[PDB]
Scaffold this active site. Structure first.
Site, PDB file in Angstrom:
ATOM      1  N   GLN A  65       8.412   8.658  -8.329  1.00  0.00           N
ATOM      2  CA  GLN A  65       7.959   9.599  -7.305  1.00  0.00           C
ATOM      3  C   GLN A  65       8.848   9.755  -6.093  1.00  0.00           C
ATOM      4  OE1 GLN A  65       4.780  11.706  -6.842  1.00  0.00           O
ATOM      5  NE2 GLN A  65       5.507  11.779  -8.937  1.00  0.00           N
TER       6      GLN A  65
ATOM      7  N   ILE B 233       2.218   7.559 -12.519  1.00  0.00           N
ATOM      8  CA  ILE B 233       3.523   8.235 -12.505  1.00  0.00           C
ATOM      9  C   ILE B 233       4.539   7.569 -11.566  1.00  0.00           C
ATOM     10  CG2 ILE B 233       2.618  10.463 -13.389  1.00  0.00           C
ATOM     11  CD1 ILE B 233       2.555  11.516 -10.358  1.00  0.00           C
ATOM     12  N   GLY B 234       4.094   7.017 -10.430  1.00  0.00           N
ATOM     13  CA  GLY B 234       5.017   6.448  -9.444  1.00  0.00           C
ATOM     14  C   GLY B 234       5.449   5.034  -9.728  1.00  0.00           C
ATOM     15  N   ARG B 235       4.563   4.089  -9.446  1.00  0.00           N
ATOM     16  CA  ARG B 235       4.788   2.660  -9.717  1.00  0.00           C
ATOM     17  C   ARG B 235       4.945   2.483 -11.222  1.00  0.00           C
ATOM     18  NH1 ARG B 235       0.075  -0.284  -6.014  1.00  0.00           N
ATOM     19  NH2 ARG B 235       0.400   1.024  -4.168  1.00  0.00           N
TER      20      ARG B 235
ATOM     21  N   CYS C  72      -0.972   2.575 -13.027  1.00  0.00           N
ATOM     22  CA  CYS C  72      -1.192   2.309 -11.597  1.00  0.00           C
ATOM     23  C   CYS C  72      -2.429   3.140 -11.224  1.00  0.00           C
ATOM     24  CB  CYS C  72       0.032   2.586 -10.712  1.00  0.00           C
ATOM     25  SG  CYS C  72       0.860   4.163 -11.012  1.00  0.00           S
ATOM     26  N   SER C  73      -2.346   4.061 -10.253  1.00  0.00           N
ATOM     27  CA  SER C  73      -3.449   4.963  -9.878  1.00  0.00           C
ATOM     28  C   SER C  73      -3.293   6.266 -10.722  1.00  0.00           C
ATOM     29  CB  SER C  73      -3.375   5.290  -8.381  1.00  0.00           C
ATOM     30  OG  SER C  73      -2.106   5.825  -8.015  1.00  0.00           O
ATOM     31  N   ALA C  74      -2.280   7.109 -10.391  1.00  0.00           N
ATOM     32  CA  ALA C  74      -2.010   8.355 -11.128  1.00  0.00           C
ATOM     33  C   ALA C  74      -1.137   8.103 -12.374  1.00  0.00           C
ATOM     34  CB  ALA C  74      -1.382   9.410 -10.221  1.00  0.00           C
TER      35      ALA C  74
ATOM     36  N   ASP D  91       0.820  -1.231   0.000  1.00  0.00           N
ATOM     37  CA  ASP D  91       0.000   0.000   0.000  1.00  0.00           C
ATOM     38  C   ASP D  91       0.856   1.285   0.000  1.00  0.00           C
ATOM     39  OD1 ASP D  91      -2.330  -1.578   0.071  1.00  0.00           O
ATOM     40  OD2 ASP D  91      -2.739  -1.200   2.197  1.00  0.00           O
TER      41      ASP D  91
END
Ligand SMILES: COc1cccc(-c2nnc3n(Cc4ccccc4Cl)c(=O)c4ccccc4n23)c1O
Ligand SMILES: CC1(N)CCN(c2cnc(-c3cccc(Cl)c3Cl)c(N)n2)CC1
EC number: 3.1.3.48
Length: 480
Positions: A461, A418-420, A414-416, A380
Protein backbone atom coordinates in the site's frame (compact mmCIF):
# COMPACT_ATOMS: atom_id res chain seq x y z
CA UNK A 1 -4.29 5.88 -18.30
CA UNK A 2 -3.20 7.48 -14.94
CA UNK A 3 -2.36 10.97 -16.39
CA UNK A 4 -4.70 12.56 -13.70
CA UNK A 5 -1.93 11.96 -11.11
CA UNK A 6 0.49 14.88 -10.70
CA UNK A 7 3.54 13.91 -8.52
CA UNK A 8 5.33 17.28 -8.02
CA UNK A 9 2.56 19.94 -7.74
CA UNK A 10 1.35 22.01 -4.75
CA UNK A 11 -2.28 22.85 -3.80
CA UNK A 12 -1.88 26.34 -5.42
CA UNK A 13 -0.52 24.92 -8.73
CA UNK A 14 -3.43 22.36 -8.65
CA UNK A 15 -5.98 25.16 -8.09
CA UNK A 16 -4.49 27.31 -10.93
CA UNK A 17 -4.22 24.22 -13.25
CA UNK A 18 -7.91 23.39 -12.74
CA UNK A 19 -9.10 27.03 -13.01
CA UNK A 20 -7.18 28.00 -16.20
CA UNK A 21 -6.90 24.59 -18.00
CA UNK A 22 -9.96 22.70 -16.70
CA UNK A 23 -13.77 22.97 -16.63
CA UNK A 24 -16.47 22.00 -14.08
CA UNK A 25 -15.96 18.27 -13.48
CA UNK A 26 -12.17 18.52 -14.06
CA UNK A 27 -10.10 16.61 -11.53
CA UNK A 28 -6.59 15.59 -10.48
CA UNK A 29 -4.98 13.63 -7.63
CA UNK A 30 -1.63 14.46 -5.99
CA UNK A 31 0.67 13.63 -3.03
CA UNK A 32 0.66 15.96 0.06
CA UNK A 33 1.55 15.92 5.62
CA UNK A 34 3.65 13.51 3.38
CA UNK A 35 2.18 9.97 3.03
CA UNK A 36 -1.31 11.47 2.32
CA UNK A 37 -3.01 12.38 -1.00
CA UNK A 38 -5.40 15.04 -2.31
CA UNK A 39 -8.13 14.72 -4.90
CA UNK A 40 -8.54 18.34 -6.33
CA UNK A 41 -11.90 18.78 -8.22
CA UNK A 42 -13.35 21.80 -10.07
CA UNK A 43 -17.11 22.25 -9.27
CA UNK A 44 -19.21 25.43 -9.98
CA UNK A 45 -16.16 27.64 -10.80
CA UNK A 46 -14.33 26.71 -7.56
CA UNK A 47 -11.76 23.98 -6.60
CA UNK A 48 -12.67 21.47 -3.81
CA UNK A 49 -9.75 19.64 -2.11
CA UNK A 50 -10.56 16.11 -0.78
CA UNK A 51 -8.24 14.24 1.60
CA UNK A 52 -7.08 10.67 0.90
CA UNK A 53 -5.28 8.91 3.76
CA UNK A 54 -3.21 5.72 3.67
CA UNK A 55 -1.40 4.48 6.80
CA UNK A 56 -0.78 1.10 5.17
CA UNK A 57 -4.14 -0.73 4.90
CA UNK A 58 -6.17 1.12 2.17
CA UNK A 59 -6.78 4.51 0.49
CA UNK A 60 -9.32 6.26 2.74
CA UNK A 61 -11.15 9.06 0.92
CA UNK A 62 -12.88 11.82 2.99
CA UNK A 63 -16.66 11.76 2.35
CA UNK A 64 -16.14 8.63 0.23
CA UNK A 65 -15.06 5.00 0.53
CA UNK A 66 -11.88 2.89 1.21
CA UNK A 67 -10.02 1.64 -1.93
CA UNK A 68 -7.15 -0.68 -2.86
CA UNK A 69 -5.52 1.75 -5.41
CA UNK A 70 -5.96 5.39 -6.60
CA UNK A 71 -6.80 4.01 -10.10
CA UNK A 72 -9.60 1.81 -8.58
CA UNK A 73 -10.87 4.85 -6.65
CA UNK A 74 -10.92 7.08 -9.83
CA UNK A 75 -12.41 4.26 -11.99
CA UNK A 76 -15.21 3.77 -9.43
CA UNK A 77 -16.26 7.46 -9.00
CA UNK A 78 -16.01 8.10 -12.77
CA UNK A 79 -18.59 5.22 -13.14
CA UNK A 80 -20.80 5.62 -9.97
CA UNK A 81 -22.13 9.21 -9.75
CA UNK A 82 -23.85 10.59 -6.63
CA UNK A 83 -21.38 8.64 -4.43
CA UNK A 84 -18.92 11.51 -3.69
CA UNK A 85 -20.16 14.35 -1.38
CA UNK A 86 -23.35 16.93 1.31
CA UNK A 87 -23.43 18.22 -2.29
CA UNK A 88 -22.40 15.66 -4.99
CA UNK A 89 -18.87 16.02 -6.45
CA UNK A 90 -18.51 14.60 -9.99
CA UNK A 91 -15.18 13.30 -11.43
CA UNK A 92 -15.77 13.97 -15.14
CA UNK A 93 -12.55 15.10 -16.85
CA UNK A 94 -9.10 13.92 -15.80
CA UNK A 95 -6.67 16.86 -15.95
CA UNK A 96 -3.60 15.32 -17.59
CA UNK A 97 -0.05 15.68 -16.26
CA UNK A 98 2.78 16.35 -18.74
CA UNK A 99 5.57 15.64 -16.11
CA UNK A 100 7.71 12.56 -17.08
CA UNK A 101 9.19 11.86 -13.53
CA UNK A 102 7.03 8.72 -12.81
CA UNK A 103 7.60 7.15 -16.32
CA UNK A 104 9.71 3.93 -16.35
CA UNK A 105 11.88 5.17 -19.23
CA UNK A 106 12.63 8.74 -17.93
CA UNK A 107 16.17 9.05 -16.49
CA UNK A 108 16.53 12.89 -16.25
CA UNK A 109 20.18 13.82 -15.56
CA UNK A 110 22.09 10.87 -17.12
CA UNK A 111 25.02 3.92 -23.32
CA UNK A 112 26.91 1.84 -20.63
CA UNK A 113 23.47 0.82 -19.19
CA UNK A 114 21.97 -0.11 -22.62
CA UNK A 115 25.15 -2.10 -23.51
CA UNK A 116 25.23 -3.94 -20.13
CA UNK A 117 21.49 -4.33 -19.21
CA UNK A 118 19.71 -3.66 -22.54
CA UNK A 119 18.29 -5.94 -25.25
CA UNK A 120 16.63 -5.33 -28.70
CA UNK A 121 14.12 -2.48 -28.20
CA UNK A 122 15.35 -1.32 -24.76
CA UNK A 123 15.01 2.46 -24.48
CA UNK A 124 15.35 5.48 -22.20
CA UNK A 125 14.85 9.28 -22.31
CA UNK A 126 17.35 11.68 -20.63
CA UNK A 127 17.84 15.47 -20.49
CA UNK A 128 20.49 16.79 -22.98
CA UNK A 129 20.42 22.09 -22.87
CA UNK A 130 16.66 22.10 -22.14
CA UNK A 131 16.33 19.46 -24.92
CA UNK A 132 16.12 15.63 -24.43
CA UNK A 133 17.69 12.46 -25.88
CA UNK A 134 15.97 9.18 -26.88
CA UNK A 135 18.49 6.30 -26.62
CA UNK A 136 17.42 2.88 -28.10
CA UNK A 137 19.19 -0.46 -28.40
CA UNK A 138 18.49 -2.66 -31.48
CA UNK A 139 19.82 -6.12 -32.39
CA UNK A 140 23.47 -5.00 -31.92
CA UNK A 141 23.86 -1.15 -31.57
CA UNK A 142 22.70 2.04 -29.71
CA UNK A 143 20.94 4.96 -31.56
CA UNK A 144 20.49 8.45 -30.08
CA UNK A 145 17.54 10.60 -31.31
CA UNK A 146 17.48 14.24 -30.24
CA UNK A 147 14.22 15.57 -28.75
CA UNK A 148 13.84 19.30 -29.23
CA UNK A 149 11.76 21.31 -26.80
CA UNK A 150 10.39 24.43 -28.56
CA UNK A 151 7.58 26.49 -26.87
CA UNK A 152 6.45 23.72 -24.42
CA UNK A 153 6.22 21.18 -27.31
CA UNK A 154 8.42 18.14 -28.11
CA UNK A 155 9.56 16.89 -31.54
CA UNK A 156 12.14 14.56 -33.18
CA UNK A 157 13.14 17.26 -35.77
CA UNK A 158 10.06 17.03 -38.01
CA UNK A 159 6.43 15.95 -38.21
CA UNK A 160 4.20 16.26 -35.13
CA UNK A 161 4.91 18.49 -32.08
CA UNK A 162 3.82 16.78 -28.78
CA UNK A 163 2.56 18.34 -25.48
CA UNK A 164 4.68 15.92 -23.38
CA UNK A 165 7.58 13.45 -23.67
CA UNK A 166 4.93 10.76 -22.86
CA UNK A 167 2.83 11.65 -25.96
CA UNK A 168 6.00 11.56 -28.14
CA UNK A 169 7.16 8.22 -26.60
CA UNK A 170 3.61 6.66 -27.01
CA UNK A 171 3.48 7.88 -30.65
CA UNK A 172 6.95 6.52 -31.63
CA UNK A 173 6.13 3.29 -29.69
CA UNK A 174 3.07 2.67 -32.02
CA UNK A 175 4.69 4.24 -35.16
CA UNK A 176 8.46 3.43 -34.99
CA UNK A 177 11.06 5.71 -36.58
CA UNK A 178 12.78 3.95 -39.52
CA UNK A 179 16.43 4.73 -40.27
CA UNK A 180 17.22 5.63 -43.95
CA UNK A 181 18.90 2.15 -44.39
CA UNK A 182 15.99 0.26 -42.75
CA UNK A 183 16.74 -0.10 -39.00
CA UNK A 184 13.32 0.02 -37.26
CA UNK A 185 13.79 1.94 -33.96
CA UNK A 186 11.30 -0.18 -31.96
CA UNK A 187 10.61 1.04 -28.42
CA UNK A 188 9.89 -2.48 -27.05
CA UNK A 189 10.52 -2.13 -23.33
CA UNK A 190 12.06 0.56 -21.01
CA UNK A 191 15.66 -0.17 -19.92
CA UNK A 192 15.63 -2.12 -16.61
CA UNK A 193 17.44 -0.13 -13.90
CA UNK A 194 15.64 -1.67 -10.84
CA UNK A 195 16.94 -5.28 -11.10
CA UNK A 196 19.92 -5.53 -8.72
CA UNK A 197 22.26 -8.29 -7.74
CA UNK A 198 21.24 -9.39 -4.16
CA UNK A 199 24.79 -8.96 -2.79
CA UNK A 200 24.69 -5.24 -3.88
CA UNK A 201 21.44 -4.33 -1.90
CA UNK A 202 23.29 -2.02 0.64
CA UNK A 203 24.65 -0.02 -2.35
CA UNK A 204 21.14 0.31 -3.92
CA UNK A 205 19.56 1.29 -0.51
CA UNK A 206 22.26 4.07 -0.18
CA UNK A 207 21.48 5.40 -3.71
CA UNK A 208 17.66 5.22 -3.09
CA UNK A 209 18.10 7.07 0.23
CA UNK A 210 19.66 10.10 -1.62
CA UNK A 211 17.38 13.14 -2.37
CA UNK A 212 14.27 10.52 -1.90
CA UNK A 213 14.99 7.93 -4.66
CA UNK A 214 12.68 5.46 -2.81
CA UNK A 215 9.73 7.88 -3.41
CA UNK A 216 10.48 8.19 -7.20
CA UNK A 217 10.82 4.39 -7.69
CA UNK A 218 7.60 3.74 -5.69
CA UNK A 219 5.61 6.43 -7.58
CA UNK A 220 6.83 4.97 -10.92
CA UNK A 221 5.41 1.59 -9.73
CA UNK A 222 2.19 3.37 -8.70
CA UNK A 223 1.87 4.77 -12.25
CA UNK A 224 1.69 1.18 -13.60
CA UNK A 225 -1.39 0.29 -11.51
CA UNK A 226 -3.76 1.52 -14.34
CA UNK A 227 -2.81 -1.81 -16.17
CA UNK A 228 -4.27 -3.84 -13.28
CA UNK A 229 -7.95 -2.89 -13.41
CA UNK A 230 -9.18 -6.53 -13.86
CA UNK A 231 -12.83 -7.49 -13.28
CA UNK A 232 -14.00 -7.91 -9.70
CA UNK A 233 -17.60 -8.89 -10.75
CA UNK A 234 -18.19 -11.84 -8.38
CA UNK A 235 -17.47 -9.67 -5.32
CA UNK A 236 -20.18 -7.18 -6.50
CA UNK A 237 -22.99 -9.75 -6.61
CA UNK A 238 -25.90 -8.98 -4.24
CA UNK A 239 -25.29 -12.13 -2.16
CA UNK A 240 -21.48 -11.39 -1.86
CA UNK A 241 -21.64 -7.73 -0.70
CA UNK A 242 -21.81 -8.57 3.06
CA UNK A 243 -18.89 -11.03 2.63
CA UNK A 244 -16.51 -8.06 2.00
CA UNK A 245 -14.96 -6.16 4.91
CA UNK A 246 -14.67 -3.11 2.60
CA UNK A 247 -17.38 -3.01 -0.13
CA UNK A 248 -14.97 -1.50 -2.72
CA UNK A 249 -11.88 -3.69 -1.90
CA UNK A 250 -12.60 -6.78 -3.97
CA UNK A 251 -10.78 -9.90 -5.17
CA UNK A 252 -9.93 -10.25 -8.92
CA UNK A 253 -12.25 -12.91 -10.47
CA UNK A 254 -9.35 -14.49 -12.39
CA UNK A 255 -7.38 -15.33 -9.17
CA UNK A 256 -10.15 -15.41 -6.48
CA UNK A 257 -10.43 -18.56 -4.33
CA UNK A 258 -13.56 -20.50 -5.53
CA UNK A 259 -15.24 -22.52 -2.72
CA UNK A 260 -16.67 -25.85 -3.86
CA UNK A 261 -17.75 -27.22 -0.39
CA UNK A 262 -21.27 -25.93 -1.34
CA UNK A 263 -24.31 -26.20 0.93
CA UNK A 264 -27.17 -26.88 -1.61
CA UNK A 265 -27.32 -20.91 -3.48
CA UNK A 266 -24.18 -18.69 -3.65
CA UNK A 267 -21.75 -20.67 -1.52
CA UNK A 268 -18.57 -20.20 -3.68
CA UNK A 269 -17.31 -16.74 -2.55
CA UNK A 270 -14.63 -15.49 -0.19
CA UNK A 271 -12.69 -12.19 -0.35
CA UNK A 272 -9.35 -13.98 -1.03
CA UNK A 273 -6.93 -14.51 -3.99
CA UNK A 274 -4.28 -17.16 -4.86
CA UNK A 275 -0.81 -15.46 -5.03
CA UNK A 276 1.78 -17.40 -7.17
CA UNK A 277 5.43 -16.29 -6.97
CA UNK A 278 0.59 -24.93 -4.12
CA UNK A 279 3.36 -25.42 -1.51
CA UNK A 280 5.11 -22.10 -2.20
CA UNK A 281 1.95 -20.19 -3.07
CA UNK A 282 -0.12 -17.92 -0.80
CA UNK A 283 -3.70 -17.00 -0.27
CA UNK A 284 -3.97 -13.24 0.46
CA UNK A 285 -7.25 -12.58 2.28
CA UNK A 286 -9.10 -10.10 4.49
CA UNK A 287 -9.66 -10.32 8.25
CA UNK A 288 -12.70 -12.58 8.95
CA UNK A 289 -16.14 -11.14 9.48
CA UNK A 290 -18.55 -12.91 11.88
CA UNK A 291 -20.49 -14.08 8.76
CA UNK A 292 -17.36 -15.29 6.86
CA UNK A 293 -15.72 -17.43 9.60
CA UNK A 294 -17.31 -20.60 8.18
CA UNK A 295 -16.17 -19.65 4.63
CA UNK A 296 -12.62 -19.01 5.90
CA UNK A 297 -12.43 -22.56 7.38
CA UNK A 298 -13.93 -24.08 4.17
CA UNK A 299 -11.14 -22.25 2.24
CA UNK A 300 -8.32 -23.45 4.59
CA UNK A 301 -9.67 -27.06 4.35
CA UNK A 302 -10.29 -27.11 0.56
CA UNK A 303 -6.84 -25.60 -0.27
CA UNK A 304 -4.99 -27.94 2.18
CA UNK A 305 -3.33 -24.88 3.84
CA UNK A 306 -1.32 -25.87 6.94
CA UNK A 307 -0.04 -22.42 7.91
CA UNK A 308 -1.90 -19.13 8.57
CA UNK A 309 -0.12 -15.80 8.99
CA UNK A 310 -2.17 -13.21 10.83
CA UNK A 311 -0.57 -9.70 10.72
CA UNK A 312 -3.11 -7.67 12.72
CA UNK A 313 -4.47 -7.62 16.29
CA UNK A 314 -8.18 -8.47 16.46
CA UNK A 315 -8.78 -4.85 17.48
CA UNK A 316 -6.69 -1.80 16.55
CA UNK A 317 -7.57 1.83 17.53
CA UNK A 318 -10.89 0.65 18.99
CA UNK A 319 -11.93 -0.86 15.61
CA UNK A 320 -12.48 -4.57 14.80
CA UNK A 321 -9.86 -5.70 12.17
CA UNK A 322 -10.50 -9.49 12.28
CA UNK A 323 -12.94 -11.53 14.32
CA UNK A 324 -11.50 -14.33 16.52
CA UNK A 325 -12.03 -17.26 14.11
CA UNK A 326 -10.11 -19.79 16.28
CA UNK A 327 -11.19 -21.40 19.62
CA UNK A 328 -9.65 -20.56 23.05
CA UNK A 329 -6.66 -22.75 24.02
CA UNK A 330 -7.72 -26.40 24.79
CA UNK A 331 -11.24 -25.74 23.38
CA UNK A 332 -13.07 -27.40 20.46
CA UNK A 333 -15.47 -25.46 18.20
CA UNK A 334 -17.61 -26.19 15.11
CA UNK A 335 -17.72 -23.57 12.32
CA UNK A 336 -20.38 -24.95 10.03
CA UNK A 337 -19.22 -28.38 8.71
CA UNK A 338 -15.64 -27.66 9.92
CA UNK A 339 -14.34 -28.50 13.40
CA UNK A 340 -11.32 -26.75 14.98
CA UNK A 341 -9.48 -27.65 18.18
CA UNK A 342 -6.90 -25.20 19.64
CA UNK A 343 -4.32 -27.71 20.94
CA UNK A 344 -1.74 -25.32 22.36
CA UNK A 345 -0.70 -21.65 22.22
CA UNK A 346 2.97 -20.54 22.46
CA UNK A 347 3.88 -16.89 23.09
CA UNK A 348 7.09 -15.43 21.54
CA UNK A 349 8.15 -11.74 21.73
CA UNK A 350 6.51 -10.45 18.48
CA UNK A 351 3.99 -13.22 17.91
CA UNK A 352 1.82 -16.05 19.22
CA UNK A 353 1.75 -19.52 17.66
CA UNK A 354 -1.56 -21.46 17.93
CA UNK A 355 -1.54 -25.16 17.10
CA UNK A 356 -4.90 -25.89 15.55
CA UNK A 357 -6.47 -29.20 14.45
CA UNK A 358 -8.91 -28.78 11.55
CA UNK A 359 -11.25 -31.53 10.35
CA UNK A 360 -14.59 -31.88 8.59
CA UNK A 361 -17.51 -32.90 10.86
CA UNK A 362 -18.47 -36.62 10.38
CA UNK A 363 -15.04 -37.43 8.87
CA UNK A 364 -12.32 -38.17 11.46
CA UNK A 365 -9.62 -39.09 8.86
CA UNK A 366 -9.70 -35.54 7.32
CA UNK A 367 -7.85 -34.11 10.37
CA UNK A 368 -4.73 -31.97 9.78
CA UNK A 369 -2.79 -29.57 11.94
CA UNK A 370 -3.01 -25.87 11.00
CA UNK A 371 -0.30 -23.64 12.51
CA UNK A 372 -1.45 -20.09 13.20
CA UNK A 373 1.31 -17.48 13.37
CA UNK A 374 -0.21 -14.40 14.85
CA UNK A 375 2.13 -11.32 14.55
CA UNK A 376 1.03 -9.00 17.37
CA UNK A 377 3.55 -6.11 17.43
CA UNK A 378 3.05 -4.36 14.04
CA UNK A 379 2.37 -0.60 14.84
CA UNK A 380 -1.16 0.93 14.38
CA UNK A 381 0.23 3.21 11.55
CA UNK A 382 3.40 2.99 9.44
CA UNK A 383 5.87 0.11 9.64
CA UNK A 384 8.28 -1.35 12.29
CA UNK A 385 11.46 0.75 12.69
CA UNK A 386 13.61 -2.49 12.50
CA UNK A 387 12.79 -5.53 10.21
CA UNK A 388 14.49 -8.15 12.48
CA UNK A 389 11.24 -9.19 14.20
CA UNK A 390 9.38 -9.64 10.85
CA UNK A 391 12.32 -11.63 9.32
CA UNK A 392 12.70 -13.91 12.38
CA UNK A 393 8.90 -14.53 12.22
CA UNK A 394 8.94 -15.21 8.40
CA UNK A 395 11.98 -17.52 8.85
CA UNK A 396 9.91 -19.56 11.40
CA UNK A 397 6.82 -19.62 9.08
CA UNK A 398 8.97 -20.70 6.16
CA UNK A 399 10.50 -23.66 8.10
CA UNK A 400 7.10 -24.79 9.43
CA UNK A 401 5.76 -24.67 5.83
CA UNK A 402 8.86 -26.53 4.40
CA UNK A 403 8.57 -29.34 7.06
CA UNK A 404 4.98 -30.23 6.03
CA UNK A 405 4.70 -32.67 3.13
CA UNK A 406 2.29 -31.52 0.37
CA UNK A 407 1.15 -28.43 2.40
CA UNK A 408 -1.21 -26.18 0.40
CA UNK A 409 -0.72 -22.38 0.00
CA UNK A 410 0.20 -20.27 3.06
CA UNK A 411 -2.81 -18.20 4.22
CA UNK A 412 -1.87 -14.56 4.91
CA UNK A 413 -4.33 -11.90 6.18
CA UNK A 414 -4.48 -8.49 7.94
CA UNK A 415 -7.60 -6.18 7.89
CA UNK A 416 -8.24 -5.56 4.11
CA UNK A 417 -5.59 -8.16 3.17
CA UNK A 418 -3.59 -5.92 0.82
CA UNK A 419 -1.10 -3.76 2.80
CA UNK A 420 0.62 -5.70 5.58
CA UNK A 421 -0.50 -8.86 3.72
CA UNK A 422 1.21 -7.82 0.46
CA UNK A 423 4.28 -6.55 2.41
CA UNK A 424 4.80 -9.92 4.28
CA UNK A 425 4.18 -11.89 1.01
CA UNK A 426 6.58 -9.73 -1.12
CA UNK A 427 9.37 -10.01 1.61
CA UNK A 428 8.75 -13.79 1.77
CA UNK A 429 9.01 -14.10 -2.08
CA UNK A 430 12.23 -12.02 -2.31
CA UNK A 431 13.88 -13.81 0.60
CA UNK A 432 12.95 -17.20 -0.95
CA UNK A 433 14.97 -16.33 -4.14
CA UNK A 434 18.04 -15.68 -1.91
CA UNK A 435 17.41 -19.07 -0.13
CA UNK A 436 17.29 -21.01 -3.43
CA UNK A 437 19.78 -19.12 -5.68
CA UNK A 438 22.05 -17.56 -2.97
CA UNK A 439 23.59 -14.06 -2.38
CA UNK A 440 24.60 -14.01 -6.12
CA UNK A 441 21.07 -13.75 -7.54
CA UNK A 442 19.07 -11.00 -9.26
CA UNK A 443 16.23 -9.33 -7.36
CA UNK A 444 13.82 -6.76 -8.82
CA UNK A 445 11.52 -5.35 -6.03
CA UNK A 446 8.93 -3.33 -8.19
CA UNK A 447 8.88 -6.25 -10.69
CA UNK A 448 7.97 -8.67 -7.86
CA UNK A 449 5.39 -6.19 -6.47
CA UNK A 450 3.74 -5.60 -9.92
CA UNK A 451 3.54 -9.42 -10.39
CA UNK A 452 1.78 -9.78 -6.96
CA UNK A 453 -0.54 -6.80 -7.66
CA UNK A 454 -1.88 -8.47 -10.87
CA UNK A 455 -3.12 -11.28 -8.54
CA UNK A 456 -4.82 -9.05 -5.84
CA UNK A 457 -5.51 -5.30 -5.91
CA UNK A 458 -3.06 -2.93 -4.20
CA UNK A 459 -0.72 -5.53 -2.70
CA UNK A 460 1.84 -3.24 -0.87
CA UNK A 461 0.00 0.00 0.00
CA UNK A 462 2.58 2.61 0.94
CA UNK A 463 6.05 4.01 0.29
CA UNK A 464 6.87 3.21 3.98
CA UNK A 465 6.12 -0.55 3.28
CA UNK A 466 8.09 -0.28 -0.01
CA UNK A 467 11.15 1.04 1.91
CA UNK A 468 10.45 -1.64 4.59
CA UNK A 469 10.73 -4.43 1.94
CA UNK A 470 14.15 -3.09 0.78
CA UNK A 471 15.25 -2.77 4.48
CA UNK A 472 14.10 -6.37 5.21
CA UNK A 473 15.92 -7.86 2.18
CA UNK A 474 19.06 -5.79 3.16
CA UNK A 475 18.85 -7.15 6.77
CA UNK A 476 18.41 -10.78 5.57
CA UNK A 477 21.58 -10.50 3.34
CA UNK A 478 23.60 -8.79 6.19
CA UNK A 479 22.80 -11.79 8.53
CA UNK A 480 23.84 -14.33 5.84
C1 LIG B 1 -11.54 -5.42 -17.96
O1 LIG B 1 -11.84 -4.87 -16.67
C2 LIG B 1 -13.11 -5.02 -16.15
C3 LIG B 1 -14.20 -5.70 -16.80
C4 LIG B 1 -15.47 -5.81 -16.18
C5 LIG B 1 -15.68 -5.22 -14.91
C6 LIG B 1 -14.60 -4.57 -14.25
C7 LIG B 1 -14.81 -3.95 -12.94
N1 LIG B 1 -14.67 -4.68 -11.82
N2 LIG B 1 -14.93 -3.83 -10.76
C8 LIG B 1 -15.16 -2.64 -11.32
N3 LIG B 1 -15.48 -1.45 -10.60
C9 LIG B 1 -15.45 -1.52 -9.14
C10 LIG B 1 -16.77 -1.70 -8.41
C11 LIG B 1 -18.01 -1.79 -9.10
C12 LIG B 1 -19.21 -1.90 -8.36
C13 LIG B 1 -19.18 -1.92 -6.95
C14 LIG B 1 -17.95 -1.80 -6.27
C15 LIG B 1 -16.73 -1.69 -7.00
CL1 LIG B 1 -15.21 -1.53 -6.20
C16 LIG B 1 -15.69 -0.25 -11.22
O2 LIG B 1 -16.05 0.78 -10.60
C17 LIG B 1 -15.62 -0.26 -12.74
C18 LIG B 1 -15.92 0.92 -13.47
C19 LIG B 1 -15.84 0.95 -14.88
C20 LIG B 1 -15.51 -0.24 -15.58
C21 LIG B 1 -15.27 -1.44 -14.87
C22 LIG B 1 -15.33 -1.48 -13.44
N4 LIG B 1 -15.06 -2.64 -12.66
C23 LIG B 1 -13.33 -4.46 -14.87
O3 LIG B 1 -12.31 -3.81 -14.21
C1 LIG C 1 14.12 7.54 -12.57
C2 LIG C 1 12.79 6.79 -12.90
N1 LIG C 1 11.89 7.82 -13.48
C3 LIG C 1 12.16 6.25 -11.57
C4 LIG C 1 12.57 4.82 -11.10
N2 LIG C 1 12.63 3.93 -12.27
C5 LIG C 1 11.86 2.80 -12.36
C6 LIG C 1 11.95 1.91 -13.45
N3 LIG C 1 11.16 0.81 -13.48
C7 LIG C 1 10.30 0.51 -12.47
C8 LIG C 1 9.56 -0.78 -12.56
C9 LIG C 1 10.29 -1.99 -12.58
C10 LIG C 1 9.63 -3.22 -12.75
C11 LIG C 1 8.22 -3.25 -12.83
C12 LIG C 1 7.51 -2.04 -12.76
CL1 LIG C 1 5.77 -1.99 -12.89
C13 LIG C 1 8.16 -0.81 -12.65
CL2 LIG C 1 7.20 0.65 -12.65
C14 LIG C 1 10.24 1.36 -11.35
N4 LIG C 1 9.39 1.15 -10.33
N5 LIG C 1 11.02 2.47 -11.34
C15 LIG C 1 13.57 4.31 -13.35
C16 LIG C 1 13.09 5.65 -13.96
Amino acid sequence: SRRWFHPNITGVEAENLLLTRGVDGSFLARPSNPGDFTLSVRRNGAVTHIKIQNTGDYYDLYGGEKFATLAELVQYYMEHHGQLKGDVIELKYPLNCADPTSERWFHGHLEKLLTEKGKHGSFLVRESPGDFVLSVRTGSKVTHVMIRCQELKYDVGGGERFDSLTDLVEHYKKNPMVETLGTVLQLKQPLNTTRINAAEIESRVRELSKLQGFWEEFETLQQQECKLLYSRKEGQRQENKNKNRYKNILPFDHTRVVLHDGDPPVSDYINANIIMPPKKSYIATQGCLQNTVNDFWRMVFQENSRVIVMTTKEVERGKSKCVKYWPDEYALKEYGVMRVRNVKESAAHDYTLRELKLSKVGQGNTERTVWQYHFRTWPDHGVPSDPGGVLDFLEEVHHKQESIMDAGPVVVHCSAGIGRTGTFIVIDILIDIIREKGVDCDIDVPKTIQMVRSQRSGMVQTEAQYRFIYMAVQHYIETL
